[PDB]
Amino acid sequence: QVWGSETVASSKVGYTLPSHIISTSDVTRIINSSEIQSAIRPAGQATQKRTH
RNA sequence: GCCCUGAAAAUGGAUGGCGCUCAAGCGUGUUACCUAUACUCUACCGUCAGGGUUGAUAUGAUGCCCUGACGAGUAGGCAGG
Ligand SMILES: [Mg+2]
Ligand SMILES: [Mg+2]
Ligand SMILES: [Mg+2]
Ligand SMILES: [Mg+2]
């Protein structure tokens, strides 16, 4: 009642809870998604070999 | 050309000094040698630029790592402590 829900309006006049600018807080799962993984090129060595 | 005369100032006095006369002087030529915080190569610190790396089961993706270049400073500005 005090702060409101998705089906109940908040008792505060004209107030709604703030929105999210990102859907989830774990970007690891977003990267590990099939669509992202199927569009990227293979990665490197993570520690480049010294050539000269 | 060199040297000499012309050429007199006040504390004692300065090719920097000693001293030097086929010079250790003057003109000219040939080599060797000495040494700057400059140049060349290397290491280390920092700054700037271009890049690599999220895949869990280990901690900083403002992380870790690869590559190149650069570094004087009053008044003054900005940044990290
Ligand atoms: Mg001579
Ligand atoms: Mg030097
Ligand atoms: Mg310099
Ligand atoms: Mg400086």
Rg over alpha carbons for chain A, rounded to the nearest Å, is 22
The closest alpha carbon to A40, from A51, A52, A48, A32, belongs to A32
> What's the angle, vertex CA A29, arms to CA A24 and CA A30, rounded to 5?
70
Biggest alpha carbon distance in chain A? 69
Experimental method: cryo-EM
Residues 8-47 of A with CB under 7 A from strand B: 27-28, 31-32, 43-47
Rounded Cα distance, A32 and A24, in Å: 13
Protein residue with the closest CA to the C1' atom of nucleotide B51: A48
Rounded Cα distance, A40 and A31, in Å: 10
Rounded Cα distance, A14 and A11, in Å: 8
DSSP element (H, E) containing A13: none
Check: CB of residue A11 under 8 Å from CB of residue A2.
yes
Resolution given for this structure, in angstroms: 2.2
